[PDB]
Amino acid sequence: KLEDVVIDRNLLILGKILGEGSVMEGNLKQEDGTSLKVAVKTMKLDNSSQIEEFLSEAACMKDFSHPNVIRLLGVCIEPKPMVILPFMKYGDLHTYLLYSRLETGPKHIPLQTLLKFMVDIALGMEYLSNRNFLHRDLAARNCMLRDDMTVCVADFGPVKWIAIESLADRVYTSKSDVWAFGVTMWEIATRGMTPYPGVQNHEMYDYLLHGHRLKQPEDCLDELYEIMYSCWRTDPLDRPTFSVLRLQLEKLLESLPD
Ligand SMILES: N[C@H]1CCCCNc2nc(ncc2C(=O)NCc2ccc(F)cc2)NCCCCCCNC1=O
Ligand SMILES: [Cl-]
Ligand SMILES: [Cl-]
Ligand SMILES: [Cl-]
Hints:
Active site: 137
Strand order of the largest sheet: 1-2-3-5-4
Radius of gyration: 19 Å
Binding site for ATP: 18-23, 37
Number of strands: 7
Protein name: Tyrosine-protein kinase Mer
Family: Belongs to the protein kinase superfamily. Tyr protein kinase family. AXL/UFO subfamily.
Bound molecules: the ligand N[C@H]1CCCCNc2nc(ncc2C(=O)NCc2ccc(F)cc2)NCCCCCCNC1=O, chloride ion
Domain Protein kinase: 12-253
CATH architecture of the largest domain: Orthogonal Bundle
C-alpha cells in the first residue's frame, strides 16, 4: 500500500473537455512548484465492489519510461478516480492523419514519415510486450503525437481491431495486440480510412473466418503490406513479435531515401 502514485486532488485544476469516456484538460501543480498542463481521464467505475484493484496497474504504469509510451503522472480522486496524463497539443494520430489530407492542415505526409509513425508504435509496443503488459485497445485514435512529433502509444489500462481468436473467445495474448498493430499500420498507410470498407461490424467474424483480410492500399509498398498482413495470420503463433516487426520496419525505412 506504499503507493506514492496518488496525487492530492487539490494540486489539480480541471478545464475544458478534450474528448468523450470523458477526457478533460487540466493543470497539475508539481513538486518543483511549477504547474504542468495535463489531460485527465474520468474512469467511470462500478463502486458496488472495489476503486482498488485499479491503483495496481497504475503504479506499474507509472514505472514506465519509454519515449514511445505515454507516461502516467498519477491518479486523483473526487469516489471518482481520475487518471492524470501529459497534454499533447498535437493530439491523436488518427485525427492528424485526416487533417493532413486538408489544405491548412499538415502537409501531405510522406511515406518515410508514415513509416516512422509505425516504428514509434512498434517500439512502444515492444517495450510493453517485454514487460508482459497487454494493450487490448491499440488503434491510431489511441496513439498520441508528442511535441517533437514522435508517436507514443496510449490508453493501455473496437470490433474491426480485434484479432479473430479474440472474437470467438475473448482471450488476448500479445499476438492479439500484434493484430491490432497491423490494423493500425493500415490506418496509417491509408491516412485514416476506417478499416474494411463495405463490411459492417456484424459481418466481421464471418468475413475473417473465410480468410478475408484488409486489402492493400493504393500507394503502399508491397513490403510494407507483407509486414502488416503477417500481423493477421489465423494462427497467433505464426504472427511475429513486436520486436521482429520493429526491426523489419526500421530496415525498410532505412532502405528509403530522405
Ligand atoms: N478519446 C480518445 C482519443 C483522444 C484523447 C483526448 N485528447 C487529448 N488528450 C491528450 N492530450 C491532448 C489531447 C488533445 O485533444 N489535444 C488537442 C488540443 C489542441 C489544442 C488545445 F488548445 C486543446 C486540445 N492526452 C491523453 C491521451 C490519452 C487519453 C485517452 C486515450 N485516447 C482516447 O480516449
Ligand atoms: Cl478543479
Ligand atoms: Cl477516409
Ligand atoms: Cl479492406
